[PDB]
Amino acid sequence: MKSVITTTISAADAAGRFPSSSDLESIQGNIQRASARLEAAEKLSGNHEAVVKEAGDACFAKYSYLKNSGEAGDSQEKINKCYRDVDHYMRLINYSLVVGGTGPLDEWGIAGSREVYRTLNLPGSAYIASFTFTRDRLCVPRDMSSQAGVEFVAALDYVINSLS
């Protein structure tokens, strides 16, 4: 699971040496930017369910042909799978937002997602429509903070550049 701590510890470990001053400056930076990260994590854990509803209802505000045949709209169950998968993605943005690297977001969500999505006929552009909605639905001074919002955008854009 990638973070600042694991990157610098793993680097000095592969080197063999004790942790010198450079690693100490790195973790110093982590506990500098910690406040903006945890602010965004607190507010995301605050109102996540409304982000679930507007997220998935925004995904079916776009492409309608999912609820058409036999692509995926064929039950309350597949639409529930739809929502809970989006909740897995937001819960990973919470996790990676707390950690401060793209670690748990990548190793739990992104790695090997592609084979599962081509295999189970899942379109990725539907998810990308959902996330581009949820990053367009921000607010600069009233929603989080100038620093927190930026960090949230970063995480979410990472998901988009991972999926497209």
Partner 1 sequence: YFFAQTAYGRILNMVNASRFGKGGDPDELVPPPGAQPADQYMANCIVKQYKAMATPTGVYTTQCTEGVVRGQAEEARNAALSAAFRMKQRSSAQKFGDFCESRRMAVIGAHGCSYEESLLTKFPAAARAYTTASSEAKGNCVRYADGTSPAETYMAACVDKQMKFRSVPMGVYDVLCSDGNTKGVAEYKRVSAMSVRFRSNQMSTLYKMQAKYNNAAYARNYFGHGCSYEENLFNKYPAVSASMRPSTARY
Partner 2 sequence: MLDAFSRVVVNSDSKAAYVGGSDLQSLKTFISDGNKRLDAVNCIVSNASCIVSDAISGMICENPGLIAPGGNCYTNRRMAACLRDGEIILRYVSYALLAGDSSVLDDRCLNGLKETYIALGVPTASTSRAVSIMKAASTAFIMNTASGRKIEIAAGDCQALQSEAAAYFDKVGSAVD
Residues 113-142 that bind ligand PEB (CB under 6 A): 116, 120, 122, 126-127, 130, 137-140, 142
Q: Which residues contact 121 (CB under 8 A, 6 or more apart)?
A: 71, 72
- Which of 80, 77, 71 is CA-nearest to residue 125? 71
- Which of 105, 106, 54, 59 is CA-nearest to residue 78? 59
Stretch near its own copies under the rule CB under 8 A, chosen from 43-51, 75-83, 94-102, 138-146: 94-102
From 42, 71, 107, 143, residue interacting with partner 1 (rule: CB under 8 A): 107
From 27, 42, 60, 103, residue interacting with partner 1 (rule: CB under 8 A): 103
User: Two tokens at 9?
Assistant: 């510890």
Determine the Cα–Cα distance for residues 31 and 84; give it in Å rounded to an integer. 32
Residue numbers of the site for partner 2 (CB under 8 A)?
1, 3, 5-6, 8-10, 12-13, 16, 18-20, 23-24, 27-28, 31, 34-35, 38, 41-42, 44-45, 48, 91, 94-95, 98-100, 103-104, 107-113, 115-116, 119-121, 138, 140, 146, 149-150, 153-154, 157-158, 161, 164
- Which of 121, 129, 119 is CA-nearest to residue 163? 129
Can residue 25 be called a binding residue for its own copies (CB under 8 A)? Answer: yes
**Chosen from its own copies, partner 1, partner 2, none, partner binding at 76 (C-beta under 5 to 8 Å by type):** none
CB of 29 closer than 8 Å to CB of 4: yes
Q: Which residues contact 134 (CB under 8 A, 6 or more apart)?
A: 51, 54, 55, 58, 90, 156
Question: To which residue do tokens 């694991």 refer?
Answer: 6
Angle at alpha carbon of residue 44, lines to 36 and 112, rounded to 5°? 95
**Chosen from partner 1, ligand PEB, partner 2, none, partner binding at 98 (C-beta under 5 to 8 Å by type):** partner 2
From 121, 136, 139, 141, residue interacting with its own copies (rule: CB under 8 A): 121
**Chosen from partner 2, ligand PEB, its own copies, none, partner binding at 124 (C-beta under 5 to 8 Å by type):** its own copies
Residues at the site binding partner 1, with contacts judged by CB under 8 A = 1-2, 6-7, 10-18, 22, 101, 103, 106-107, 110-112, 114-115, 162
